Structure formats: C-alpha cells, structure tokens
Scaffold this motif. Structure first.
Motif, PDB file in Angstrom:
ATOM      1  N   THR A 110      -5.106   2.365   0.835  1.00  0.00           N
ATOM      2  CA  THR A 110      -5.365   0.905   0.713  1.00  0.00           C
ATOM      3  C   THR A 110      -5.170   0.399  -0.720  1.00  0.00           C
ATOM      4  OG1 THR A 110      -7.782   1.136   0.488  1.00  0.00           O
ATOM      5  CG2 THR A 110      -6.850   1.065   2.712  1.00  0.00           C
TER       6      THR A 110
ATOM      7  N   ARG B 104     -12.098   1.792  -2.430  1.00  0.00           N
ATOM      8  CA  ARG B 104     -10.873   1.713  -1.623  1.00  0.00           C
ATOM      9  C   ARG B 104     -10.629   3.114  -1.059  1.00  0.00           C
ATOM     10  NH1 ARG B 104      -6.805  -1.962  -3.240  1.00  0.00           N
ATOM     11  NH2 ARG B 104      -7.783  -3.836  -4.115  1.00  0.00           N
ATOM     12  N   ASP B 105      -9.372   3.411  -0.745  1.00  0.00           N
ATOM     13  CA  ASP B 105      -8.838   4.741  -0.397  1.00  0.00           C
ATOM     14  C   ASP B 105      -7.417   4.748  -0.960  1.00  0.00           C
ATOM     15  OD1 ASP B 105      -8.523   7.259   0.748  1.00  0.00           O
ATOM     16  OD2 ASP B 105      -8.327   6.468   2.817  1.00  0.00           O
TER      17      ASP B 105
ATOM     18  N   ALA C   5      -2.473  -9.818   4.313  1.00  0.00           N
ATOM     19  CA  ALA C   5      -3.432  -8.687   4.374  1.00  0.00           C
ATOM     20  C   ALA C   5      -3.141  -7.787   5.562  1.00  0.00           C
ATOM     21  CB  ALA C   5      -4.845  -9.191   4.486  1.00  0.00           C
TER      22      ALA C   5
ATOM     23  N   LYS D 275       0.416   0.513   6.479  1.00  0.00           N
ATOM     24  CA  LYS D 275      -0.512   1.654   6.354  1.00  0.00           C
ATOM     25  C   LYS D 275      -0.574   2.422   7.675  1.00  0.00           C
ATOM     26  CE  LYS D 275      -5.239   2.185   6.670  1.00  0.00           C
ATOM     27  NZ  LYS D 275      -6.651   1.893   6.331  1.00  0.00           N
TER      28      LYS D 275
ATOM     29  N   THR E  51      -2.149  -0.353  -3.930  1.00  0.00           N
ATOM     30  CA  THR E  51      -0.708  -0.605  -4.156  1.00  0.00           C
ATOM     31  C   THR E  51      -0.215   0.437  -5.153  1.00  0.00           C
ATOM     32  OG1 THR E  51      -0.638  -2.265  -5.976  1.00  0.00           O
ATOM     33  CG2 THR E  51      -1.171  -3.043  -3.769  1.00  0.00           C
TER      34      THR E  51
ATOM     35  N   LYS F 121       0.130  -5.533   5.388  1.00  0.00           N
ATOM     36  CA  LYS F 121      -0.139  -4.321   4.579  1.00  0.00           C
ATOM     37  C   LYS F 121      -0.878  -3.301   5.454  1.00  0.00           C
ATOM     38  CE  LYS F 121      -0.663  -6.211  -0.152  1.00  0.00           C
ATOM     39  NZ  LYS F 121       0.084  -7.481   0.039  1.00  0.00           N
ATOM     40  N   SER F 122      -2.048  -3.634   5.988  1.00  0.00           N
ATOM     41  CA  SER F 122      -2.808  -2.773   6.938  1.00  0.00           C
ATOM     42  C   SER F 122      -1.915  -2.178   8.047  1.00  0.00           C
ATOM     43  CB  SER F 122      -3.935  -3.520   7.528  1.00  0.00           C
ATOM     44  OG  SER F 122      -4.798  -3.951   6.498  1.00  0.00           O
TER      45      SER F 122
ATOM     46  N   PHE G  67       0.847  -1.202   0.000  1.00  0.00           N
ATOM     47  CA  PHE G  67       0.000   0.000   0.000  1.00  0.00           C
ATOM     48  C   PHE G  67       0.875   1.241   0.000  1.00  0.00           C
ATOM     49  CE2 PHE G  67      -3.681  -2.192   2.439  1.00  0.00           C
ATOM     50  CZ  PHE G  67      -3.988  -2.910   1.322  1.00  0.00           C
TER      51      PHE G  67
END
Lengths: 65, 48, 66, 66, 48
Positions: free
Chosen positions: D56, D52-53, E33, E40, D58, E36-37, A2
């Motif tokens: 969030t 999404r945002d 998952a 963030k 890639t 990644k979160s 991300f």
C-alpha cells in the motif's frame, strides 16, 4: 502506483541478502519476525546518529546488574 | 531458491527455467498465436 | 562485542598498560579483522601486545578466525 | 526498546510455530505502533507517521523512506 | 427465433456534466484510491 506484487517479493529478497549489513527496519510480519526483530541488535548504541530520533531509548545497551 | 540462487520472477511452467519479460515474445509469441484465435479444433479441448 | 571491537580502544587500553581482548564478534571476514588488527598494531608502542576473543558458538567465526 | 523485546519473548516468540502467524495478524496494528514508538528497527512501511504495508506504498514513498 | 436487440452506450464524460464540482472532485479522489487498491489485488492474485 502501489508496489507491484513482484517488486514486494524482490524487496523482501534483498532484505534477506547475507552480503549486506542487516537492514535497519522490519519490512513484514510473517514467520521470519523473530529474526528481523533481533538480527544485528548491538551496534546502534555506538552510532545513535543512524537511529530514528538519535534516541538511546530504542537501543540495546549490554551491562551487568 | 532456483538451483541454490534466490530468484523472484517468471519461469517456464514446464522446465522451471528463469524467463525475463523482454524474452517472453521471442520464447513464446509464435506458440501463443498458433494456439489462440480461430484455428483447427484441438481435440484435447473437446473430450477427443 | 560492541566495546572492545574498536581498534582505537584496544590501542588506548594497551598503551595505558593493561590487557585487552580485541572482539571477534564485531568482524565477519578474516579480511576485515586483519584491517582492524593492523589498525591496533599501528597505534600501539613497540613490544606491546593484545589478545583476541572468538565465540565458540559461532562456528563460522572459528573456521576463519583460527 | 529492550522492554518491548522482553514483552515479545513472553507474548509472541515463546508460541509454537502453527500459533505464530495467527497471533501476529491479531495484534498486527499494536506491534507496528510499538516498533515505531519504541524500537531501534522501526516498521518500514510508515509514511508521515501513518502505518501501511509494502503493498500500500508508492515506489516514491519507498525510495524516500530508504 | 425472431430476437432483435439494440443498446446505445454514451461516453461517460456526459454523466459528470449533471453533477457539481464538489461532488465530482469527491468521486475522482474516491476512484483514484480504488484503482490503486484494485491494482494491488490484481497483481497479487495473478502471480499467486
């Protein structure tokens, strides 16, 4: 991976660049939403090739009742 | 906005002057190694 | 703004024998308008004329436009 | 697109400044769905039609969407 | 005050031998998952 928190802030900085055709999307819901939503609303009718589904029905067409 | 210009990055906490990541070692390594680790007790940390 | 911005329309209307304002609304720099006005002038017949629309609400357009 | 525009002037853009960001969070998912269905400026952060945002998505998903 | 202690820590790849390929593959996804979160969240909370 991300988007790094910093690269989001950079992305939104390039979206506010005034030496640039206003960017053909809404990248955030914040205070600046009325500007993002309305900014550069009149060219799309002339150029449907560059709108999402080549779709009139997204567009602003100015006309008199 | 940094002095008119729009800036997004790190910034010296004292001078608020823009710092690049490549320039952090040069600017600050020496100071980080002097003020980290086992070292002379710094009084400002332990109520003088 | 969108319709009479195109030099190719302003030309076609003027060539037809009718009056038309070229729209300032569609131009940001004096450089980019000059490019348009030159595009009109090349496409029209000798001794033809056209006019210019500048918006009084857009004081940026006026301090280059005028 | 314009009917969406109209609804936002009645619902969102007539609100005072303190009341705006609370309101936008409450109906966030609705607004995003409308922008994507109905408007000339879609919501940027959608990958395969799924909201999404930026935070969030890639780096590849972002460059593909640009 | 006479206060010995020992702990053995075994490498976590010894856990995953005790579970099925379906369960492992399900877990792997679920973590990939999360990570990644968490990233963030980390970088957001770091700069702000």
């Amino acid at each position: 991976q991300f988007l790094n928190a910093q690269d989001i802030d950079h992305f939104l900085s390039m979206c506010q660049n005034p030496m640039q055709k206003p960017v053909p999307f809404v990248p955030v819901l914040d205070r600046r939403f009325e500007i993002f939503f309305k900014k550069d609303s009149l060219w799309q009718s002339e150029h449907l090739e560059a709108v999402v589904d080549q779709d009139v029905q997204r567009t602003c067409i100015l006309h008199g009742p | 906005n940094l002095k008119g210009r729009p800036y997004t990055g790190w910034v010296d906490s004292k001078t608020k002057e823009p710092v690049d990541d490549k320039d952090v070692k040069a600017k600050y390594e020496t100071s980080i190694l002097e003020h980290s680790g086992i070292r002379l007790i710094e009084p400002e940390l332990f109520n003088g | 703004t969108p319709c009479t911005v195109s030099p190719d329309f302003v030309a076609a209307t003027t060539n037809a024998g009718y009056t038309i304002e070229l729209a300032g609304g569609g131009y940001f720099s004096a450089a980019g308008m000059t490019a348009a006005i030159d595009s009109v002038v090349s496409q029209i017949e000798k001794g033809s004329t056209f006019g210019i629309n500048l918006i009084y609400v857009n004081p940026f357009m006026l301090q280059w436009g005028i | 697109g314009v009917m969406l525009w109209k609804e936002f002037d009645e619902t969102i853009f007539n609100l005072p400044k303190n009341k705006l960001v609370p309101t936008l969070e409450a109906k966030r998912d609705y607004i995003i769905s409308r922008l994507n269905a109905d408007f000339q400026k879609p919501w940027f952060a959608t990958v395969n039609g799924q909201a999404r945002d930026l935070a969030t998505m890639t780096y590849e998903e972002v460059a593909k969407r640009l | 005050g006479q206060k010995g202690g020992q702990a053995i820590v075994v490498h976590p790849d010894y856990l995953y031998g005790a579970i099925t390929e379906d369960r492992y593959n399900e877990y792997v996804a679920k973590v990939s998952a999360r990570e990644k979160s968490a990233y963030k969240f980390f970088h957001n909370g770091m700069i702000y």
